[PDB]
Each structure stands twice: as C-alpha cells, then as structure tokens.
Design a binder for this molecule. Structure first.
Ligand code: SF4
Ligand code: SF4
Ligand code: FCO
Ligand code: FCO
Ligand code: SF3
Ligand code: SF3
Ligand code: F3S
Ligand code: F3S
Ligand SMILES: [Cl-]
Ligand SMILES: [Cl-]
Ligand SMILES: [Cl-]
Ligand SMILES: [Cl-]
Ligand SMILES: [Mg+2]
Ligand SMILES: [Mg+2]
Ligand code: NI
Ligand code: NI
Lengths: 264, 581, 581, 264
C-alpha cells in the first residue's frame, strides 16, 4: 500500500525543526519514515548528494506532481538576489517555487518558515521572508515554535495521514489542536500568578518553590503553543517547568518584542 | 588554468571540474567543487558555504543577558553550545562568577550534547558512506547474529531480530518508494563491508535513530527543552530543592533520578553499539587510514573545554585540553590566547564580505561582518553559479587562521593535542585503539581517524556525564544548592564599557564568541565557529583550509559518484549554519 | 478424624497436618492446610481467606455515582475491573446507555489490565515455582543464548547479555543478602529446567519487571493514573478533541499516538517473551499436565466479557464468551443468568458470617454481609490458630455456587467454555499449543494448563487492544467523539427503586456486582469475585471449591517444603483482597 | 558494600502501594531491589512461604535488630480481637508490633497505613486503624495517596539512601518535598478556575477544552500531593488531566467528605 510522498526542503535555518522531528517519541521518527510517509527528498538525511540528489528532486516532483506534500524548514532571503541561500548554484527561492508548484499542500515547520525567526529579527540583514509571503497559491499549514514540540510535529503528521485531511487552522494558519490556547491558560504555575507569588531574582526562595516567572519576563500570557500541556521531550519538561520564562518563540516577531527579561 | 604550491600541496585547476551541490547529510548548505587529473585524482578542492543569516549583525543593540538565546539559534544540531559560549563571554566581560552547581550543570549540558551529536553523526549522517544499506538485503541473519555477538555484549543480536530488520527493509524497498535510499551510491567499489556487517550496521542505524531521543531528556530537565534549551547569565535557571516544601516546583530527587537513568542508558548504548561499530568500520576500511590526512599532520587547534574548577578556564581546570600545533611539530604544543590580536584572525579576501583592507586578517574584537555577494566570473551569472571562481571570492564562510596558519579543529585535533600534551588516558586509549587495528599511530591522521576519534570522544563524554552528576550530588549532600549568582544581574552594576571572550570545544571543534558591551547593550558580537575553521576558503597567501586539504590528492573510482568526497567531508561533521552564522 | 466422599474425591483428615501461612506470591492474606497420608499424598485441603474489610457494608448509603471509586479499592492488582463492574451495575439499575467510544475505551481498559495482570503473574508471582533462580548461576551463557534463539525471535539474546544477567545475580547474592530468594525451595527435585533455561527465565523475569510499567500508561491516558484509574457512570471522563481549539485539554492525536505505541510494544513483549517461556515451561514439566486438575474437568464458569456492541451484554456482543459446564459435560455449555435466584448463590455455613438459615444459599440480591468471627474448635485458640476446623467455619471467603454446583473460574475455565462453544480463534490457539507439546486436549485441565491458558489470554488481549483502538479511530474519522451520556446523571432522574447487575471477566475469572438503589442511595451492594469462587470454603453438602479440589491427590516430594502446593495455588493467581472484599 | 535491610509487611490493604512501587520509572524497581536496598521480607514477591517465610522474618528482624527499615502497607483492624487480618494464625497487629520494635524507622506507605483509607470509611466494620495510633515510639514517615505516585515512592527511597537520613516532614509526618503544596496550587487548569471556566456536565464543550473540574467535585483545593507537577506513570497523566476531579485520595478521611461530585 503506497505511502504519501513528502519533499522536505531547507532554506535559511538552524535545523532545529528537523532535530525536533527526530526526537518524536510516539510515533518514533523511524516508524514515520518507514511506515507512514515516503520521505523522498531531504538534504539532512538522504543518501544521494549533488547531481544524484538533484535527480531525485526532479523525478519526485515530476512523477508525483499534484500529489506530494512539501515540508519547508527555514526561509528564503530576498537580499543579494536571493544568493544569501544558494541551492545547486541558484537562489533557494527558485527551488522553493518549483517544489511548491507541484505540491498538494505545504507544511511550514517552525517560526522560520512560518514568520521569519532569528534571521528576520532586526535589522534582518538578508531580507529573510516567511513562506506565505512568497507562495501565495497553495494551502500552507504553519507549525510555529523554535522549534515546534517533537510530538506536536508527529501528531500533526499522523492526523493528516489517518484522517486524510489538513488540520483545521486559526486565522494565522496554525493548527487549532495545538495552537488554540495560550501557554498561560494551561500553565501549572498560574496559581502563583493569581496569588502574586513571583520569582524576583534567579534562585531566590520563590524560584525554589516553583513560583510564577512573570516578573522574570515570561511571555506565556501572549504565546499560543502546547508547551504547558503536551510538554517537551516525551513530557519531561518545558521552559517554565525548568525555571525560565517563555521567550514567546511560537509568536511572530518574538525576538523584537523587547528583552526576554522585561515583563509582558 | 593555474597551479601553485602551498602547505606541501600542488593546487592545480587544470582538468575536469566536478561539482557537488548540494552536499547532503550535513547541517545546512554547502557546495564543493574539485578538479581531477587524468588519473582521477583530486588536484584542486574548493569549499563553499552557501548560506548566511547575519547573527553578528542582529546581536548589535541587544541586552547582553538575552544574547545566549539569539546565538543559540546559530545551530540546532549543536544546540546549546553557542548559548554556553555566550554566557561565558558575557560573564567574562562583566566580571561574573557562577556557583559551582551552575558550572557542573553547564558541563553536563555540554557532555550531553557531545554524546548526542557524535552518536547521530556516526549513524544518521556519516553511516551510509560506509554501510551499503541495499546490500543488507543479501545478508544471512544467522551470520549477522554471529558477527554482532563476536564484537559486543549488546543484547540485541538474535537471528530473528536481524531477519525482522531485513524484512522490514525488504518491504520498505519492494514498492519502489526508497525514500532516503533513492539514487544512492550502493554497489560502489569502495563499499567494503560484507553483507552481514551491512545488516548489523543498518540495524544499529535504526536503534540509534530511536535511542538518540532519550539522551536529550537531560537537557529537558536542566534546560526545559531540546532543541534549544534555556540558560542564564549568572548560572542556570533550574533552581534546586531537594528536601523543602515546594520541591515539586524545582529540580528535586525525582528529576535527578531521571537524569541518572538517562546517563546510564547513554553510556551503555555508546559503549556497546557505537564503539564496536566504529572499530568494525576501521577493520574493514584500513586503506582509509591513509586518505584524507589534510592538515591533521600539519596544524591542529583546540581551545579546551569543561572547566572543572568553577570560573577557572586555565590549564589546571579544563578537562579537555587546549593547545596548538603548527608545522607538523607535535613535540611543541603551543598555548592559545584568544585576546592576543596576533593569534586568531579572520580573512575575507576569498569570502563574500567587505573589509577596508582585504589583505589583512582581523582579530574578532576588530571583526567586521559586512556582507558583499560578489562571485566574479563564475561560468554562468550572479544567480547561476556553474563554476565558482576560487581565485576570487567564493564562500559565505570567513577564513580563520592562528598566527597566520591554517588549522584543523575537532575530535581528531583534540585527540592529537591531548595525546601530545601527555594526557595519560588519551595516550593509553589511542595506543590501544591503533594496536587493535594493527595500524601505526599516523593512521589516526586520516578520514578514518576522524571517525575513530569521534567515537572515542562519545565514550569519554558519557563517562564524564557520570563524573559531573556525582559532583553535583556531592554538593547537594553538603547542602550547597546554589545555581545562580545575581549580584551583577542588573545593568546598573555593569562596567560602562567592557569586553569578554567565551570559549569551548563544541562537538565539531574550537568555538569562540567575542563580545563588547557599551552602555548596557551589545556593541560588537563576533563568532568564530569550528566549521568556520575547517570549511574555510583561502587567504591572501593562498593557504587552504582543512576541508580543501583533506580532499587534495584523493583518488576517485567513479568521478560522477562523489563517494570519496562525501566520506572525507562527512568525517568532519560539517555544520554550515554554524560556519556562517 | 473423618472421611467423606464428594465430587469423586475422598476427603480424609486423618494423618499428618501441614500448614502454609502465609501463602506468599499472591495478593493479600491466605492460609492453606492439608492432610497427607503415608505416601505423602494430599488427602484433605483447606482454603482460608485470612482478611476482611467489608466494602459491601461501607457502600450502604453512598451515592451510586461514587460506588466505582470505593469498590475499585477492593484490589490494586486487578485495578480497574471493580470500577468497570460498578459502572455497569449502576447503569443497568438506572437505565443508562453509554456512547460507543466510552464502551470501546472501557474495553481497552480491561484488555490493558489483562495484559498487565497476566504478565506480572507469570513472572513475578508464579515464575519462581518453575524457575530455579540459584541454578541460573550454573548456566553457560552461550548455551543460554542458543536456547533463547531456538525459541524466539526476541532480540535480547546475546551470550554477553546472559553473562551480564548472571553476573548481576552472582553480585546480588555474594554478600549473603539473598532478599526475595532467601530460604527458597531451590534444588527441590521438582525443579526440572536445565541451568540455561533457568537463566533465560530469570533474565525474562527482570525484563518483565521493567516492561510491565509501560503497559499501564494506557490506563494513565484514559483513566488518569495506574493503579486505580478513574471512571464515571455514563461513560468515561476522558473527553476527546482531535481537531478543535483546546485539544491540549483533552484526548488528542498525541495522546492516541502514545496509546498506539504502547499497544505495539505490549503485543511484541507478550508474543516473543511470555508465550515462548510458557511453552518452554510446558516442554520441561509435562507431568504437570496431569496434576492439579481439580474442578477443571467437572464444572467451569464464565460470565463473558468485552461487549463489542455498546450496551448489549448478550451472546452476539460479548467477545469473550460466557457459559457454564457441569458434571463434566462439555457438550452442554449452559447459559448464565445473573438475575435468576436459582443460579448464583453464596453459602456461609463454613464461613465467618451470619445468615438466618446457614443451610441455604442466598442470591446476591438477597445477600447479607454480617461478619461473625467464630472459628470454633480449633487446635490452639481463636487468636492463636494452630489448625482450623474445616468441619465448621474456617474462612472470611463466602462459598459461591452455580445451581448448587462448585465451579472453577478464570483463564482455564474461559478457554474451555470458548473452545466448546466453537470460538474459532480459541480452538485454533489451543490446538496449536497442545500440538506443540504433544499433549492431548485433556492436558489443559491441569495446573500446567492454567498457566498455558493465562499466556494464551495475554496474547488474545494484546490483539484485542489493537482491534479496539482501531474501532475508536474509525469512530473519530466519522466525527463520532462522544464519551459520556449525562441525561440520567442527576439523582432526580433515577427510578425511586431499581436494581442492576454489572458483570465482566476479570483476569482471575467471573466477576459480578449486584446493586440496589433506593431514594438516590445504595440500599444493597453485593460482590461475588473470581477468587471468591476459586478459594471458596465448603457448602452444606460438603462440596469443595476449586483450590481445595486442585490440591487433592497431589504428591509432595518433601512434606515440609510446600512447592507442589504453591505451584497449584499460584496457577489460579489468587487474589485474596478480591475474594473477601 | 551491604545494602540497607528492609522488611515490608502488609495489613488490611488492596496492594495498590506495592503495585505503584513496581511502576517506578527512575530508578526502576528492579534496580532498587538489586542495588539500592536489601528487600529482605515481602509476602508479595518472596520465594519462601509458610514456615520458610516465617524463618526469614525471624532471622532478619533478629540479625538486623535496630538496623532495618520497616515499610508498612495497609493497616491493622482492632475488631474481632484483630482476627479480621490473620498472619501465621495470629492477629496481624502482633506481627506489626514485633516488626516495629526492631525497626530504626517506619515508612507508612499509602493512605491505608497513614490514615485508614477505604476500610476505615463509615461505618468502619473492622475498626481499621492507622499505624501511628498503634505504634507510638518510632519515627513514622507518612507517604499518603491511594496509592502514592510511583516515582514519589522511589524518590523518597533514593533520598534516604543517598542522604542517609529521613526526609524532612510536615506536622502530619508527610515528606515536605512532595506533600508541601496543594494539587490546586500547581494545577494546569488553574487559569480556567480563575476565569470561572468550568465543566458543568461530562463531555460538554468545556470538558473538551480542558476546563476546570471544580463544579464536578474536584478536591484539588484541599489536597496535598505531587500529582499536578510530578504526575503519574512517568509523567503521562494525572486524574485531572484525564478529565476527572481529584478525589482527595492523599487526605485523611477523604472517603467521608461527601460525594466525590459535590463541590469542595
Ligand atoms: S510562569 Fe508564565 S505562563 Fe506560567 S503562570 Fe506565570 S506568566 Fe503565566
Ligand atoms: S481542576 Fe481541580 S485542582 Fe485544577 S484548578 Fe480546577 S479545582 Fe483546582
Ligand atoms: N559542534 C558544533 Fe557547531 C559547528 N561547527 C558549533 O559551535
Ligand atoms: N482478577 C481479579 Fe480480582 C479477583 N479475584 C477481581 O475481580
Ligand atoms: Fe527549526 S530552523 Fe531553527 S531558528 Fe527558529 S524555527 Fe528556525
Ligand atoms: Fe496501596 S493499599 Fe490500596 S486502598 Fe487506599 S492506600 Fe490502601
Ligand atoms: S519559549 Fe517556546 S518552547 Fe514553548 S514555553 Fe515558550 S513557546
Ligand atoms: S485523587 Fe489522588 S492521585 Fe492525586 S490528583 Fe487527587 S491526590
Ligand atoms: Cl532543500
Ligand atoms: Cl519571527
Ligand atoms: Cl506481612
Ligand atoms: Cl482515610
Ligand atoms: Mg563570524
Ligand atoms: Mg461478596
Ligand atoms: Ni552546528
Ligand atoms: Ni484482585
């Protein structure tokens, strides 16, 4: 029984979303790759390089025109005629457009693909631009976070495969299932927020009792993600549980909303 | 075409030009070109970083306390190491000393990363250069079990297991959806493993893909998440509470028990799966002890890492030794100073950046990151590079040099430095490893040697995790719980103008961040990262970097199939996002 | 002394009396006494439950919606099954129909419990009756590997693994701190496994001790926690949300993915570790196919379980069949009706309770739990019992009968009922198992057969987990998300007076809860639990229960070492807290 | 080096606390038994039965008099001269008293040993009585819950072994580390409580969004435990996360505080 073809491309990025994907606990990334999808192109993992890789790319997007899913990590830079990110001697944006043209739908993994992330932070030297400002004629599901949670990535994949449809999304294109609520609306330190019980300086008595991180700059009140519920790395922790406020990493523009240590 | 001599090589761009773009099974974007002569031997090699983001520019004007979070996103593969170098640099600038538990926990974070990064590189990135996956379909499961059982105590070795792995591969391939295996180099004559070893290796590839997810649970406990854990200037945010009310809100005995469980499993996997597989690769590929030497018999560099005395970055503290060797003189390991303007310098005469004078090198405190895409006459156009012009600017990677010398960094470099400084564990380990392979010591200075050193380092790091965990537990037994110093958290406490250097050994090699603070904000932030060294383009003297050198003089069996190029490049674990930042 | 005949046995209490108090490797508190003749053959057996709590009394006056939570605490080993029987009973009384997903999730909860309970019993409770742990120290690791690999595809079989396990055991006992192994029966002549099979089994004991914790993660997803998950009258509390805002607050795709991962792992462990070990015990202990028959060739009982059609408890719905066989007539599987006052009755003439007429049995809707500790003419005294008097009251366990017949319940019973009703999967599994051992079908009616059936049921339940999971996902794909019916949640909606029966097959056998509600409160709540059947004392006719019958006629090699008694008792997986409640 | 001797006895109980212990994820119960302690008597797990088990009990409490830790699960009944729970033909209380006399300290596992639990709920037919009302001359650490969290049980054990001392306790004898805060003070649904966002009937829209269970009878506001932070079964869930209110199962008398579905 054939598996759905997937093409995974990489613009300007740090590769954290790929790393997050391989951290998936259930299903294991191994079983996603072997049993759920056909990951037919991916520079990080594929055997072929160079001309052999370019042949795989061309063959898959032609053979499966209109039927593959495009996963995108990172983003295209518009500066220097696109040559801040070069793919087979040409601007990455050309490869992005070719891959997008044949896709049935696009998954924009991470804050880079969704919004811009760190390379788009002031002063955006490369004119890094999110996927939906370049590709304007295709369904784009945004899965933001730096990176998104591993088991969120894999749940989104299994939803699409099992239900044979894209997830329902909010007005920004984020899946409602994992992005419908704020971190602060499911945070286990909310009792302390409500009581005025705050960490005031690192490793103070409050910190040692797990008090709220709002005065340390937590951006949980304005950030939509699943970190406080689903949690990270097979439910082991999340930023706030280990004592650091949320940075706001799933939100557009989070790098430029003031210091991480300044209050919401 | 031209020819010139440098570092014992004859750099000759006559003959057929081969291009490999993209390089795959790396992090980020790289292009490589070579020329080969009539004997299909490489006579010219060109390393090109094909991405840039500009973190050094973005960091200007940030609060120094926030810098770690931005620079962490230089790279998600070596996640955490740039945060560590950042907090070190900002603390060095301001004059902050962290409590011992914070230092120990930082050391745990770094050793966890070494374990993870080295393991995933061995299997997921480099492994398919050495293991012919499709050939595993021809293996006898019983002979595979016998092979595995001769190499290791690892439990997972039954004939039925290897049959089940083989059958899963067979079903995966049978419909033509070969995925990551499509259009590979399978059957190339340089694949030397027998079918049983290919099936064993492939089974282990899958086991490592599963297992690696567990290692980073240590980062989740202390840092919240992986990738991209959290840190603070002044220590770590993971406050500890073992025996007081509200320990549920902190690092408590249950959290520590989780960490210990992961450490034990990590050491077990590395010692019984990765280490025997590395040695087996060595046994079946001995000629690669003589290929890809490059700069590893000439010039190698380590800054050192893992300060065991908190806030002491000197030789008596660093558990991973620093030093430099030049001119092939391994009897004189030289001290490195990251403030000395005559030591680390970066050149851009062959890179896409502007300096006021491109014939001189700039120490990072005088660094400039002014991007300038100017490829000259490629065959093609500015948006269609058919052939890079290595006589002019050809990369987004700057060219670092040490006292004007081109250096190799990374596991092999570190191993050589420690060995020649007379580190007893390193000397004993290396000697026993080369003895087991019936190879001379010089065999480590090679593409095979890079792989062997990486495995050795994974084992070392897994051991150090336990050592650091035990040191933390000793402190807790003595009632020393502190994880952060906050006396200089507030900007009003800082010097109006100050500068600092943060350094460490990332999985790929020597890492430094140079920061200047003025008026409470970052005035300058310059990074020189391990792959910047290794993947470096040329300098005003024409000297070549580690990758270019390692590729020189290499025979290719089949020019159109760049397996030998991939093998040597992958042996360095290229991280191109790191290199360019 | 006296002698009398019942059920084909001669019950004779002359001769030497042996006492085993405590019975260990069970749940709860049991005492067993036997008499043995000159030939060391058991001629009398006495089953005594040595605890009582009184849940049937405690439930009076409670809100029926709370009952499940109280009765769940009948037992932590069969955790969940009393909650299930409770919500069934209360729904039956009030007239509540649950949504399909609630029924499917409940079926998943039950199948999960079967897998867990059967696995842990096999290794942690019964295993040391069959495996000589100390004899594992004499095994050859290579021969252990070869044996394991001859029996299974399970991966964990290397000679180095078995050596490591053996060295862990050697270190454990080296300081003379033998722990749970101290003063065991090691070296008894009835231990028949070779050293290599002992080491294989001991390795697996440790693997199962580790792995069992994972199975119950399915309970944690749907029920919050294990032990003692949560339930509701009307369905389950675990609301589902796959594709809407706020799925982070509900059973979502990530939670379902976790469940699927556990199902696969559970089936793999059962099929490749437990099943081959059960067969290996069979191969080396064939004489035990003729020992411990008891009631299993006479009278067996199943209520049935796992309704596949929601709210339909009939024969066309229950995936695990119900029925009764009496008089050894397996050609006549009889239907069971739990409301019929002439079918299930409990007697207390030999138990520590008061009835108005102790010579008759009471159906549970007429049940009475009026505790009366009266051991009568014991050897010793009422607070220092040297010998119970089985001619009068001798247990906290009531004596259930079906149409006046003494029945065996549990895995062997169910297997016999399903086989003789013609269930294809049961017939195929049993025929293949008995073929593999070269034993006749009658060999299942035995102590060895109880163990084989338990392993069969673990494999059956692991397969059913996947079936139920897939049914749930099919509903979700069709937009059917409902998990609770609440139209009769409020007490004002209930009948002023009503009664109900909740029944299922717990791991140990047929379970029923009979409840009467009046004026919004529990008026009566009577439980008859599987070990109540099996561990039953005698009735007014002197008829013996399943444990006493199974022990009759057993040869003992060494009277002072009760290994044969333990083997037979443990084969039923006694749960004494269940039995007495 | 020798491991610390532990004697584990069982009164009236359901055996949930033993089951909880073997669910421990870190350290595994296997490693606790093999490497951390010497579990020298335990009716649930030990090979010996009857006279052989009685010889173990005698031998250990004599050889290691003053030096073993006694773990108690369940409780003694005072009714019927103690013969609601019979061990070796005598009241269980006699075994408890003999074991307690030689112990250096006692761990009362679970609500049964700590307070009484279900058998002590009205009308307490057996006169079940918690350990500290019988044993009045020994340190008793109460670890309540029905059962306590697996990794709480193992963390307490590792604490004692590692630090060579009893955990610090509150005024009720419960370890401060895990019992110092209320469920409701670290509950991830607290945002909803503070907003007046409540489940009103099972499987309503509120339930499907993870709203607060206060109106469904959640006893989290008056219950001290680690369920909302440490969570259950290697962090997988806890009662509230899976949609049922807290029953209050770590608190004395929780069965007789009204219906589980009546508000706190
Ligand atoms: S820690 Fe952050 S998300 Fe949690 S309650 Fe406080 S401000 Fe809200
Ligand atoms: S669900 Fe219970 S513990 Fe959580 S906020 Fe609501 S009342 Fe408090
Ligand atoms: N390791 C690593 Fe990344 C690189 N090069 C850094 O620093
Ligand atoms: N299984 C089980 Fe427990 C018993 N007997 C119940 O019901
Ligand atoms: Fe996951 S590539 Fe890493 S930087 Fe922020 S999302 Fe981007
Ligand atoms: Fe864990 S034995 Fe189970 S009933 Fe409540 S604690 Fe008791
Ligand atoms: S920083 Fe990111 S990972 Fe979650 S807790 Fe905040 S959205
Ligand atoms: S019922 Fe018990 S298990 Fe925790 S959430 Fe409440 S204390
Ligand atoms: Cl790409
Ligand atoms: Cl952004
Ligand atoms: Cl006991
Ligand atoms: Cl209580
Ligand atoms: Mg730089
Ligand atoms: Mg009853
Ligand atoms: Ni990197
Ligand atoms: Ni039970």
């Amino acid at each position: 029984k054939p598996r759905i073809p997937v093409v995974w491309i990489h613009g300007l990025e740090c590769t954290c979303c790929t790393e997050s994907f391989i951290r998936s606990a259930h299903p294991l990334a191994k079983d996603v790759i072997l049993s759920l999808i056909s990951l037919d192109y991916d520079d990080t993992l594929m055997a072929a390089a160079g001309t052999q890789a370019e042949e795989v790319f061309e063959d898959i997007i032609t053979q499966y025109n209109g039927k593959y899913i495009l996963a995108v990590e990172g983003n295209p830079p518009l500066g220097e005629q696109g040559m801040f990110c070069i793919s087979s001697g040409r601007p990455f944006i050309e490869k992005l457009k070719r891959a997008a043209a044949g896709a049935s739908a696009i998954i924009a993994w991470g804050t880079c693909a969704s919004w811009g992330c760190v390379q788009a932070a002031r002063p955006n030297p490369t004119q890094a631009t999110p996927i939906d400002k370049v590709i304007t004629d295709k369904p784009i599901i945004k899965v933001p976070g730096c990176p998104p949670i591993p088991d969120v990535m894999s749940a989104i994949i299994t939803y699409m495969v099992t239900f044979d449809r894209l997830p329902d999304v909010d007005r920004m294109g984020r899946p409602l299932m994992f992005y419908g609520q704020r971190i602060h609306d499911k945070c286990y330190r909310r009792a302390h927020f409500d009581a005025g019980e705050f960490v005031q300086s690192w490793d103070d008595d409050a910190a040692r009792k797990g008090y709220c991180l709002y005065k340390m700059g937590c951006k949980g009140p304005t950030t939509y993600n699943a970190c406080s519920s689903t949690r990270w790395n097979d439910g082991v922790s999340f930023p706030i549980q280990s004592g650091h406020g949320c940075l706001g990493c799933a939100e557009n523009g989070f790098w430029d909303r003031g210091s991480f240590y300044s209050r919401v | 075409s031209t020819q010139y001599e440098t570092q014992g090589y004859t750099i000759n761009n006559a003959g057929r030009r081969l291009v490999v773009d993209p390089i795959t099974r790396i992090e980020g974007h790289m292009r490589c070109e070579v020329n080969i002569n009539d004997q299909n031997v490489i006579t010219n090699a060109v390393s090109c970083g094909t991405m840039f983001r500009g973190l050094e520019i973005i960091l200007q004007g940030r609060d120094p306390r926030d810098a770690w979070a931005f620079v962490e996103r230089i790279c998600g593969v070596c996640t955490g190491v740039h945060a560590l170098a950042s907090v070190y640099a900002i603390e060095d600038a301001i004059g902050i000393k962290v409590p011992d538990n914070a230092n120990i926990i930082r050391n745990i974070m770094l050793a966890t990363l070494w374990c993870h990064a080295h393991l995933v590189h061995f299997y997921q990135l480099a492994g398919m250069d050495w293991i012919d996956v499709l050939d595993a379909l021809k293996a006898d499961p019983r002979k595979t079990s016998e092979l595995a059982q001769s190499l290791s105590s690892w439990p997972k070795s039954s004939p039925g297991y290897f049959f089940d792995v083989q059958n899963r591969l067979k079903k995966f391939v049978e419909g033509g959806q070969l995925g990551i295996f499509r259009n590979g180099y399978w059957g190339h004559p340089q694949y030397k493993l027998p079918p049983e070893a290919n099936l064993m290796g492939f089974a282990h590839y899958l086991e490592a893909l599963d297992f690696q997810r567990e290692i980073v649970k240590i980062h989740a406990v202390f840092g919240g998440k992986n990738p991209h854990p959290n840190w603070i200037v002044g220590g770590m945010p993971c406050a500890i509470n073992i025996d007081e009310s509200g320990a549920v809100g902190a690092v408590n005995m249950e959290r520590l028990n989780l960490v210990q469980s992961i450490i034990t499993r990590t050491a077990d996997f590395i010692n019984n799966v990765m280490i025997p597989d590395a040695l087996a690769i060595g046994q079946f590929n001995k000629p690669w002890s003589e290929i890809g030497t490059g700069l590893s018999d000439k010039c190698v560099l380590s800054y050192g890492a893992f300060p065991d005395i908190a806030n002491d970055f000197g030789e008596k503290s660093l558990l991973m030794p620093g030093g430099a060797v030049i001119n092939g003189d391994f009897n004189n390991v030289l001290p490195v100073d990251l403030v000395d303007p005559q030591q680390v310098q970066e050149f851009v005469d062959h890179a896409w950046y502007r300096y006021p004078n491109d014939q001189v090198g700039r120490h990072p405190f005088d660094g400039i990151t002014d991007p300038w895409y100017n490829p000259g006459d490629v065959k093609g156009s500015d948006t269609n590079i058919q052939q890079l012009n290595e006589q002019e600017r050809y990369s987004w990677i700057k060219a670092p040099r040490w006292r004007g010398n081109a250096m190799e960094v990374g596991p092999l470099a570190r191993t050589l430095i420690a060995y020649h400084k007379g580190d007893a564990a390193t000397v004993e380990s290396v000697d026993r490893m080369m003895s087991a392979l019936n190879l001379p010591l010089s065999g480590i200075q090679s593409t095979l040697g890079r792989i062997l050193c990486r495995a050795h380092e994974a084992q070392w790091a897994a051991g150090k995790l336990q050592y650091f965990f035990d040191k933390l537990m000793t402190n807790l037994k003595n009632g020393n719980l502190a994880t952060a110093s906050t006396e200089k958290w507030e900007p009003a406490t800082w010097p109006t103008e100050c500068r600092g250097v943060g350094f460490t050994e990332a999985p790929r090699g020597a890492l430094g961040h140079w920061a200047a603070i003025r008026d409470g904000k970052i005035d300058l932030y310059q990074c020189v990262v391990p792959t910047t060294w290794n993947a470096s383009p040329r300098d005003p003297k024409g000297q070549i970097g580690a990758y270019e050198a390692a590729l020189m003089n290499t025979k290719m069996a089949i020019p159109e199939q760049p397996l030998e190029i991939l093998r040597t490049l992958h042996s360095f674990d290229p991280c191109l996002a790191c290199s360019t930042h």
